[PDB]
Write a protein that binds this ligand. Sequence first.
Ligand code: Q6B
Lengths: 32, 449, 61
Amino acid sequence: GLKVGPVPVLVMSLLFIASVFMLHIWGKYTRS
Amino acid sequence: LEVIKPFCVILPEIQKPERKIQFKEKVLWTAITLFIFLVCCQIPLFGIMSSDSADPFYWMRVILASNRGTLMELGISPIVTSGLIMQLLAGAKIIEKDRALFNGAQKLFGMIITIGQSIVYVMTGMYGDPSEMGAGICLLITIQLFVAGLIVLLLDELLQKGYGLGSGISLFIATNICETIVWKAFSPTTVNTGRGMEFEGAIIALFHLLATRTDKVRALREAFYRQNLPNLMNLIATIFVFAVVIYFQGFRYELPIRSTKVRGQIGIYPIKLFYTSNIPIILQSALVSNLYVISQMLSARFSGNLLVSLLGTWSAYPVGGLCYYLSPPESFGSVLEDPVHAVVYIVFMLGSCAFFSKTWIEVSGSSPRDIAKQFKDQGMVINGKRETSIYRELKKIIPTAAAFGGLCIGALSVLADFLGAIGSGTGILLAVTIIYQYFEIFVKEQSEV
Amino acid sequence: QFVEPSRQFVKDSIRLVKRCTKPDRKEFQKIAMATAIGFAIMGFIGFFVKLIHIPINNIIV
Ligand SMILES: CC(=C\C=C\C(C)=C\[C@H](O)[C@@H](O)C[C@H](C)O)/C=C(C)/C=C/C(=O)O[C@H]1CCCC(=O)O[C@@H]([C@@H](C)C/C(C)=C/[C@@H](C)[C@H](O)C[C@@H](C)O)C/C=C(\C)C[C@@H]1C
């Protein structure tokens, strides 16, 4: 079991946010 | 144990804070957690073809801290589902290092129910028809909601393991309610209906109306009694309800108790008037929201059935049925038009809140019997009363206190709904009670210091 | 019928609220200030996040 702290949780949340943003940007760019 | 042992040690887990986190750092971590929750609440999902449909779960957006079409479409749903399923398993005794196993099992079950809920949400018709999106887009939306639910669970454990204050459910619900109120009070969005630019925020609208309009009295009237957008009467009502709930939440019956085993531990035992802190509001709001959602589903699928029609008739607000008498009146003109509906709604609110409080004191171990057992455990006899009259005084105070607290909180919700305050009675009461819980945590930490 | 239990409950509630420790100004001001601070924190953080993310949502969508 991986025991992460609060900073890893914040980093994971920011990385998921960035992944969603990159998905949106990739969709917008493949539309154009 | 069973065969679920391997799978309960796969999801991430939050380590103990080792030290004791100071209140300033706990506040900072709570602020970071709510900031993450809000930021993810403002980020839309990917693959949504159209959000022009009608929200099937619109009534569970305040009680679940959700936001349609975004990463927090489910909101606090994983936490609630995991807690409910684990309570069901523990009560029926199938599943009772034990703490680590319990946490792993609750995470796994919450995430499985999160996947099921994401599938249900996709199939409800929102985001467009699930056939035009395709299996790839449906799976992508499900994966995004899965990761969002995992993040929500991680934030909840971050709050509950000692890094932050309170829990994820209360923090997120209060944050959503406060954000809604502040948006309705300060939004810069302008809606034009031919008259001119009109800010949605009540205070910004007041300032713009005063600045632009040549007739200041007319601007004041149209900014205070505005009906197309939130006005200043709504804000004044919201502040007034805040004040009254704050005043009544400080009510407490202080029982002077003294220890008999360890002499010298003289203290005070306060019995608050709001004995069940916003528990009646939570129960009533959850019941009403769920009843509304299943009523909407049944009306959409089985329109015409007498059983469905009596459950509630929907136009997206009830216009008849059992779900219509459970709804706050939109305006006082509706109260004047239909007084029977208003009377039934008031009676339902008061009775349901009182009954929920009186049931919860027994269910959660807050009845005079358990408090008397605790007093016997610590020898905490009353200074004036004898050791054989603890149960009598507890029966005198606690049941009446709980019943009247439920009655008063229901009456406050009814008053906030009748005044048309921003965020309705449910949201206002939930937010203020959660903030008071955080203030109680603060004063407890200060007392420890 | 049920009039007597209701009267009993009403009288018990009146006795309770009378016997209760009603907040004074020194406590009401402190509680109101704390609630205002918490409400301001959460609501304004949400308001500013929404303000920031409206143009971001327009750009990405
Ligand atoms: C106000 C509040 C919490 C605040 C808590 C506080 C402040 C706590 C503090 O810590 C405390 O210390 C404070 C102290 C006391 O002072 C409210 C709560 C918890 C509400 C829960 C709720 O509504 O939880 C339902 C929905 C859950 C999520 C979902 O949706 O789970 C579907 C899903 C699996 C399937 C689904 C999506 C079905 C469709 C058909 C519809 O959803 C129909 C449903 C609504 O029937 C299955 C449905 C289920 C389990 C029904 C559940 C009851």
